[PDB]
Amino acid sequence: IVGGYTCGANTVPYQVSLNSGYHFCGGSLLNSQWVVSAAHCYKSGIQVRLGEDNINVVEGNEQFISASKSIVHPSYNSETYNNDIMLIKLKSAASLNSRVASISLPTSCASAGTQCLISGWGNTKSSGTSYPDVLKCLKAPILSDSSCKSASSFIITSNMFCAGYLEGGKDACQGDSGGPVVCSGKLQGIVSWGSGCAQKNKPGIYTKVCNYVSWIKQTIASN
Ligand SMILES: COC(=O)[C@H](Cc1cccc(C(=N)N)c1)NC(=O)CNS(=O)(=O)c1ccc(C)cc1
Numbered sequence: 166i167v168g169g170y171t172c173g174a175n176t177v178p179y180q181v182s183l184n185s186g187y188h189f190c191g192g193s194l195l196n197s198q199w200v201v202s203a204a205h206c207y208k209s210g211i212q213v214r215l216g217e218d219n220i221n222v223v224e225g226n227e228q229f230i231s232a233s234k235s236i237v238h239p240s241y242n243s244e245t246y247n248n249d250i251m252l253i254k255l256k257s258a259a260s261l262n263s264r265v266a267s268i269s270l271p272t273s274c275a276s277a278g279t280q281c282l283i284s285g286w287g288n289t290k291s292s293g294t295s296y297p298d299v300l301k302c303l304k305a306p307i308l309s310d311s312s313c314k315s316a317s318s319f320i321i322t323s324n325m326f327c328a329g330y331l332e333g334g335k336d337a338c339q340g341d342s343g344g345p346v347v348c349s350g351k352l353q354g355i356v357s358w359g360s361g362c363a364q365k366n367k368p369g370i371y372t373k374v375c376n377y378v379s380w381i382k383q384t385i386a387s388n
């Protein structure tokens with residue numbers, strides 16, 4: 166997260182870190198047994214880390230639980246990142262508490278201009294690299310598709326939205342992928358892609374979660 170702020174320990178209790186020896190992506194807890202992340206974060210041997218603030222220090226509220234199954238969206242396209250969404254089932258249910266908690270799925274989508282909270286342990290620099298230990302947070306609005314497309318020339322699909330600031334300085338970044346975009350109490354986005362980080366006229370691109378809720382619910386019901 167570039168241009169954000171330190172969230173405060175466990176203030177984003179649905180935020181998970183995906184670990185394969187090291188943090189590599191974010192995720193969001195959606196019930197005690199399931200995490201949602203980006204398909205482009207898929208790998209085998211994922212350990213889900215819940216209750217994290219400092220990812221390099223055991224502070225006392227963590228739960229480390231191995232993935233038992235990962236399910237990449239049936240129509241995920243790795244070239245364009247269309248349908249960049251994945252479900253991860255935990256080998257054992259998380260013990261839910263004030264620091265390890267689910268985020269509600271939307272019943273309807275979020276409109277342009279709606280303010281959201283984006284969070285993660287990604288790079289905090291727009292030029293070069295610096296990776297934080299504690300969770301970072303950013304408030305950012307959803308942009309209209311037309312403004313986003315005209316400013317950026319990005320090719321996006323109806324399964325993506327743009328959020329951030331066209332002027333630059335505030336954005337998600339490498340290492341935030343898979344993590345949450347929460348707007349008005351609902352998980353509306355997953356950190357997916359962009360061009361650099363926090364560059365002018367290059368806002369962040371997010372998987373549009375509202376389009377996937379029926380798939381999420383039926384997948385969870387059957388697995
Ligand atoms: C700094 O490193 C990068 O090049 C960015 C990081 C990144 C990741 C996620 C979000 C942002 C953001 N600024 N909001 C930035 N990667 C990428 O930006 C994308 N990875 S990518 O290069 O593999 C890629 C690019 C474009 C498509 C359609 C699909 C995949």
Ligand SMILES: [Ca+2]
Pocket residue numbers: 217218219220221222223224227
């Ligand atoms: Ca920790």
